[PDB]
Design a binder for this molecule. Structure first.
Ligand SMILES: OC[C@H]1O[C@@H]2O[C@H]3[C@H](O)[C@@H](O)[C@@H](O[C@H]4[C@H](O)[C@@H](O)[C@@H](O[C@H]5[C@H](O)[C@@H](O)[C@@H](O[C@H]6[C@H](O)[C@@H](O)[C@@H](O[C@H]7[C@H](O)[C@@H](O)[C@@H](O[C@H]8[C@H](O)[C@@H](O)[C@@H](O[C@H]1[C@H](O)[C@H]2O)O[C@@H]8CO)O[C@@H]7CO)O[C@@H]6CO)O[C@@H]5CO)O[C@@H]4CO)O[C@@H]3CO
Ligand SMILES: [Ca+2]
Ligand SMILES: [Ca+2]
Ligand code: NA
Ligand code: NA
Length: 481
């Protein structure tokens, strides 16, 4: 009954074209461990075969056309993806597609464009007169032709770019007659511009086309929902309308979660408000708290985990997580939750009632970057916690955030899930004990630590309390034997 998301990729997976096949072959394992939805990496042609997917060359090429030196994407072919999705749906696993509509990379040809430079710390400030640049803005899709869509892109569909090919120069250029979109993040004055050619969401043909593509994409892959990339760089009212549009055309719920990357609840709440709460956001602040706790050696006040997060104020609109492809070692938003703390963070997201939790492929299977700082495979430490969620994390919750280090929570169980109920303890410092209430209805049951970290059994007293133990820097989750 509890739903669990999985981000089904990490940044450094090998470019062998086998990822979709792997996903298909992992569907039985995912279903058995209680994963009910997967977020798949962008499925369309990037700027090269080894693009992780955020280049977004051709949104209508799902690994079907020979473009950018390849038919397949990094991950495989359209057919392979569709076979994987078909296996996942056969096991009631929903599929959320990644939607990268901020920009387009890898244009087929340059165009001469009149532009001005803007200040990278304040993109509202113009720092040059008009100049002629060669911008990568012409998309003809020579390998695709007009199959699925005859829409061609030119400079006038974009607000700007970060490269002039004539002078070989990396600067933020705003095209003549264009204005950065609003509302976007107010960081750097206006954070519309991120990378590649920035899509102009003031352009009515562009808004129409991206909405149309949205519906096509959903149908083509039989998607159940969306993950929205880089939303702080995309006109908020457009995103709102886009989500409503695809829902209207497909007739389905299309659960949607946006990646709004800011460690600030206020900014996330503004975004929710400006999109009428029609979709969820990732709980970025909670991730940063996990990161802080993991790097402070016991010095973090664990009571802080209850405040300043999306899940603390808008639990129905939070997707909670520990790490992702941007926070993993080496990557652009690097803030990795250290290995020792990572299971404790997973207990917090998986066994508490608030939020829609997500597990990271990189945490399960490890990351394959070229460093000696990669995330090791933690599948065996995470499996028990997933099981706790799937089978035990039901009913009324009681919180025990009453200590700088050792914090815990219980779940009473629900009569709809047989033998459900748990008692969780995590500590960033020394271990110890906490007496916690698990419900009088559990009186006399014998509970054991599903993680195997503690070998002691705890018998629940007549008043519904047990005396629970946790080791130093560890997690224990007690459930009925
Ligand atoms: O697994 C489901 C769910 O579990 C967790 O949610 C629990 C939550 O943490 C608790 O706080 C409590 O919820 C109470 C809530 O917090 C109170 O605010 C109140 O809610 C009332 C609303 O205030 C009121 O507005 C109205 O709500 C309606 C919505 O406005 C309307 O949009 C629609 O809701 C839909 C969502 O918008 C949509 O996103 C989708 O929701 C899914 C979540 O996005 C997804 O994360 C997950 O939710 C988790 C949640 O994250 C945990 O925190 O699955 C959701 C279901 O698919 O779909 C929604 C439904 O279509 O409709 C609602 C009302 O129908 O009314 C509500 C009261 O009904 O009281 C709440 C107590 O009921 O308990 C929940 C449940 O465990
Ligand atoms: Ca933008
Ligand atoms: Ca614009
Ligand atoms: Na723009
Ligand atoms: Na602490």
């Amino acid at each position: 009954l509890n739903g669990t998301l999985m981000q089904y990729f990490e940044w450094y997976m090998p470019n062998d074209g086998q990822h979709w096949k792997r996903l298909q072959n992992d569907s039985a394992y995912l279903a058995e461990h209680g994963i009910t939805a997967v977020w798949i990496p962008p499925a369309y042609k990037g700027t090269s075969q080894d693009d992780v997917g955020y280049g977004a060359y051709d949104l209508y090429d799902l690994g079907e056309f020979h473009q950018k030196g390849t038919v397949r994407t990094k991950y495989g072919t359209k057919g392979e993806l569709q076979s994987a999705i078909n296996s996942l749906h056969s096991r009631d696993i929903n599929v959320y597609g990644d939607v990268v509509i901020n920009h387009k990379g890898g244009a087929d040809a340059t165009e001469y464009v009149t532009a001005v430079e803007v200040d990278p710390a304040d993109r509202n400030r113009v720092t040059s007169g008009e100049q002629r640049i060669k911008a990568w803005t012409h998309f003809q899709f020579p390998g695709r032709g007009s199959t699925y869509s005859d829409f061609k892109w030119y400079w006038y569909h974009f607000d700007g770019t970060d490269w002039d090919e004539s002078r070989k120069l990396n600067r933020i250029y705003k095209f003549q007659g264009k204005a950065w979109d609003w509302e976007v993040s107010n960081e750097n004055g206006n954070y519309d511009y991120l990378m590649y050619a920035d899509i102009d969401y003031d352009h009515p043909d562009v808004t129409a086309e991206i909405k149309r593509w949205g519906t096509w994409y959903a149908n083509e892959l039989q998607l159940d929902g969306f993950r929205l990339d880089a939303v702080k760089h995309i006109k908020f009212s457009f995103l709102r309308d886009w989500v409503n549009h695809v829902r209207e055309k497909t007739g389905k719920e299309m659960f949607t979660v946006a990646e709004y990357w800011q460690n600030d609840l206020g900014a996330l709440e503004n975004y929710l408000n400006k999109t009428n709460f029609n979709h969820s956001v990732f709980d970025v602040p909670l991730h940063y708290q996990f990161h802080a706790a993991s790097t402070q050696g016991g010095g973090y006040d664990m009571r802080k985990l209850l405040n300043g997060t999306v899940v603390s104020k808008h639990p129905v609109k939070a997707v909670t997580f520990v790490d992702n492809h941007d926070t993993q070692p080496g990557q652009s938003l690097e803030s990795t939750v250290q290995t020792w703390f990572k299971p404790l963070a997973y207990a917090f997201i998986l066994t508490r009632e608030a939020g829609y939790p997500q597990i990271f492929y990189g945490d399960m299977y490890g990351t394959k970057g070229a460093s000696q700082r990669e995330i090791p495979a933690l599948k065996h430490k995470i499996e028990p916690i997933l099981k706790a969620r799937k089978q035990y994390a039901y009913g009324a919750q009681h919180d025990y955030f009453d200590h700088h280090n050792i914090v815990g929570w219980t779940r009473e169980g629900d009569s709809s899930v047989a033998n459900s109920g748990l008692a969780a303890l995590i500590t960033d410092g020394p271990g110890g004990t906490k007496r916690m209430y698990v419900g009088r209805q559990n009186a006399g049951e014998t509970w054991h630590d599903i993680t195997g970290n503690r070998s002691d059994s705890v018998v629940i007293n007549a008043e519904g309390w047990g005396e629970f133990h946790v080791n130093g820097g560890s997690v224990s989750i007690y459930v009925q034997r």
